[PDB]
Paper text:
report the characterization of 4 highly potent NAbs: F4, F6, F7, and F9. The structures of these 5 complexes are almost indistinguishable. that these NAbs prevent [name] attachment to the permissive 2BS cell surface. binds to the BC loop of [name] and the BC loop of [name].
of [name] by F4, F6, F7, F9, and R10. regions of light chains and heavy chains of F4, F6, F7, F9, and R10.
Numbering used by the authors:
A (entry chain A), B (entry chain A): 3 to 29, 40 to 272
C (entry chain A): 3 to 29, 40 to 93
D (entry chain C): 51 to 246
E (entry chain B), F (entry chain B): 5 to 220
G (entry chain B): 112 to 167
Amino acid sequence: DDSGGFSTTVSTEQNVPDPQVGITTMRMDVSGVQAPVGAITTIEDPVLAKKVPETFPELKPGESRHTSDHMSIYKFMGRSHFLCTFTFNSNNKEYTFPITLSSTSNPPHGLPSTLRWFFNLFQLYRGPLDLTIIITGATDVDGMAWFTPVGLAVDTPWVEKESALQIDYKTALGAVRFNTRRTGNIQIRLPWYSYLYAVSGALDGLGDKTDSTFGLVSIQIANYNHSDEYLSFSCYLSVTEQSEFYFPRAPLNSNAMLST
Amino acid sequence: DDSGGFSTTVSTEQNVPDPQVGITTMRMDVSGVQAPVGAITTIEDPVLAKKVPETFPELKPGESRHTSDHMSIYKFMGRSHFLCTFTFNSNNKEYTFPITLSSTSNPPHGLPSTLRWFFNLFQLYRGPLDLTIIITGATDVDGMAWFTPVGLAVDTPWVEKESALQIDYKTALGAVRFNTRRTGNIQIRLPWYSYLYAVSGALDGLGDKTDSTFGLVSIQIANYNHSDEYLSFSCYLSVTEQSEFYFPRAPLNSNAMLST
Amino acid sequence: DDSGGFSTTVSTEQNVPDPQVGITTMRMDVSGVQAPVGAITTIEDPVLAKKVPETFPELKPGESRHTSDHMSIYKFMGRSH
Amino acid sequence: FTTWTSIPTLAAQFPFNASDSVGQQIKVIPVDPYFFQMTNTNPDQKCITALASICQMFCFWRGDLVFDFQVFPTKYHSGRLLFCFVPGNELIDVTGITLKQATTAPCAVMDIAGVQSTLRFRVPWISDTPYRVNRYTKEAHQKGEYTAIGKLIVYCYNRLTSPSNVAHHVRVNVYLSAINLECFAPLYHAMDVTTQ
Amino acid sequence: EQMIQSVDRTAVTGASYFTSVDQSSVHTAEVGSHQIEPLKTSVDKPGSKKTQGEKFFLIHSARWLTTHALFHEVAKLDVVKLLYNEQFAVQGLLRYHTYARFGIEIQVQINPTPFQQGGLICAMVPGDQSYGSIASLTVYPHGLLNCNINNVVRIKVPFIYTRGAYHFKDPQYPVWELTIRVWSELNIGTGTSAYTSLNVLARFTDLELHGLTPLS
Amino acid sequence: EQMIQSVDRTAVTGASYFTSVDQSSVHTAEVGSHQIEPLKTSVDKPGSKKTQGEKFFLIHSARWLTTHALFHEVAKLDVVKLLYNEQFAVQGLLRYHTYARFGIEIQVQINPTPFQQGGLICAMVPGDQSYGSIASLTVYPHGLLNCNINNVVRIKVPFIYTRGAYHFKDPQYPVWELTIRVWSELNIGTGTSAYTSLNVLARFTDLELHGLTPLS
Amino acid sequence: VQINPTPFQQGGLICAMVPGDQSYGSIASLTVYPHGLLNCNINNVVRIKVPFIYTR
């Protein structure tokens, strides 16, 4: 031991991640003629709690009949889930929304149904995300979207107003330029630009307003509008292969799972 | 025998699938100088009914003069056939239609002409399908379509109304976002997400409302409309190479073949 | 096991017939310098109840002085009653 | 996602009183990963389990559920419980089953006071369909689609004998995990307390 | 130094589904052993699942008349529901289990005099006699009964179902459905019997049984 | 010269006890084959005679009090008659067969607090608790329950009977008879519980079944 | 963590190490964390060893 401790017992590793592949496959019977000693146990001992359970004679389940494994995070959360939606009402306006992992921020100003469930299953998130925005409404509208890391100057979140920034400051952060007649969709990465190791969701105090947000996406539109037509944007998040997840955590209860 | 039976006769396999390739090819004459013993037979014996028929002296048909084989299911039903059509009439509405294989559901609320014929030729269907939707009508209309498996909460089928679901629930199931000015078409797969082995068409009772449907596609539109313009959607189904077909069945009669 | 049972313990045979010939014969001492561990026991365990009893230092009884064995059924009940 | 589903977390809580008769059904459990009944007062919340959080985000489930029954006696209570599994679905008239009739089904007894505290009751997968649907999204019942593979009954096998200077009841915790779990066809759903 | 052995505290016993964890245990006390019979009191093979479940049972008796027209349905019967009855020996295996997976063996028997003429068809239709054609009943596993040729047909089918097993207490829909249609009409002369009797035998094959349950 | 084959007239079919001789026969028509499940809907082993007959069943629940005197008989029960009841899964095998030959596995369980003291005896007596001595119950296959040492005893016995098998519908006399006598009295102090519960588990071993019969 | 019951008492405790915040998660799922169960019949000492888990 490096720390100078001593013990006569054995210390074992508790709750090892990923103990089994969640597809039916083969890595005779499962239980058999031998008497099941794993039926009776002591749960207060972490060594005896790792014993394989059996009580009844069984046999092997066989193999499944679909190729993919739906119980993996990189395939479950590879599906792009809903993030936010908002509408514009006037000309030359600017809207700003952060991607906050915190569970204190309730929707509409926070993570909705499935993303609120997922980012409170674990402690630490580190890596780039994957944003898709969808344009619904007017046509011949020129818009520009850019990405600001946390700790830098930007307009007020969740408020649609005129922009107090200049065009030299917007285009220096990296921006895209679209038109609502040609595309109707933008599939854009979001870089991992932070000064800290990883961001977390389940925090309070001044750690909730610092270590929860990691990035911040804002959109400005021009050439809107003519007489009577609405313009609506909707955002969707997916996860990438460069991202990582650490330290599993107790899931949210049935009163914190909220939606829009 | 495993089940303990006994017999002095021989049990043979009856109605083996795919006995012949339906193209003219070569795998002298077919019948010849030898007397045709296959003209007379007994049809009540399944062993004697497998005898090759001949009664007249013939010769070989030769080879055909087109490459493909039109008598295969994966090339016949690879052509995309008609499924449904519907129109919108107001703003921010939501339409919902299931893909029901049941023959009890008559069209327009069911399978039309060619798809009703095909899914009652066999007993069991297992695998993913292939949906193409076609937009006809207005422009600058933003729409969103998603897929819900059977057994989950969704709006009422075959009814156009306001949506009672939230944006967190829609985008968590996986959705596409289009605009009617840019594309006019979406060619989208439909995953095989069911809790049962396979779905069937020829059922009655409470097995008809459970084991017939496999999936359910619903579409919501926004930014529609300006003053006077219609909007029409039309759906088409194709079959994939991952799909399977089991246990051939007696085909539908001439009074159940119906169309739109 | 044929019947499908299972156990972590050992099942032993209880009350085996004819454990000893009822004539005095030889099949030093019986008990000796070694401490008698068979004095204390547990009668509720059928495995520990098969332990040979001893508590005091003894020696062998020798041999009897009649040929027959009166403790056999086929000689006891061979007499007509 | 097996990191959360293979963790045994608490789902139920029932006492084993000394004032109940032999053969009386103490508690009945529907055998599905969507079962939990615990809740807390301050703050107002409905305590989900780790298995019901992962399985609520799918349409179809499959696998072997492992119930864990942890008793809290002294060294001086003495009794037995009978854990019976009646295969079927979540809606069968199950309260007419007597104690002698319950030994037809696969069951297991448990001596309460001892050096071990937990009995692991791995339920085999018994079904007519290969998978089993998350029907709690719907609001009406339908014959043929179900959520459970049967119900699990707890009986009073022997009475609870004890002295006068100990408490006259023993409480049992029920844990819930899964082995050979398979789920597919994702959705979104937030579960609710099974008020039984 | 001698060691005094004591009785064992913890042990696990049972027979393959009942598990008993004991804090105070003891060894088993067994007398005798298993003996064979050199003069047997029963010379048949002993009972098992094979000789009780896989055995022919009479499930239906109909009668085919000269007044039934063409394509008239002599027998329309669910095969698996009729085998789930108290009067058969397979009930003792099915009353206590929950799910099953099985194959079906059918034998259909008639008895005409050779002064009669006519025909029947005996098709095994899975699930439902739906909107399909009556003239295409030779696509299914079937058998033709002609009064001149034969009087016994026999059919063997595997398990065809949308789920993995069948639930006897609360089924979704019937697995198999036997129909017997008039394929050619029964004609007689003067004085000949205007009827013939019909009988259907059925049995399971490859019977799997899962999940024994207390509630029926 | 070519030979025209015809349908076979005589054939014998059935499953091991039903024999059908047919004067007009035909070959069997089978579609498909037996398929395995690569994704199984049930992961336990399938049902058989071993997992349904050889399994522990609760047959009796008594209670041992401080008012029962010495040599009082807490439980006097016929073992085989109590297993022949509708509520157990072994009834489905025994309702349809006539004779049987079996071994018995007994497990007796009690639960005292360690402030109690006393003892019991649990002997397996074949046939009859006759005029023999109560103090000589340790000659039979037995087990001693002491409140200080253990709380579970288990006994395994072979088939001991004057005939070759046992007839359930009309028996001659009971095969086994379990008795539970008070071997030392139950004593408590002030406030201690004046009772303890008792439970008897029983199962068959090496079950042979002969002569399936229609009448019950 | 150490407790001391007499063997006439009965009950149980849980001792979980939660990083950062006892947030909106479930109380019935405290066996996901590095934890220990204290039963008055079995034991009276549990011991837990955790690494450094932090956002900085």
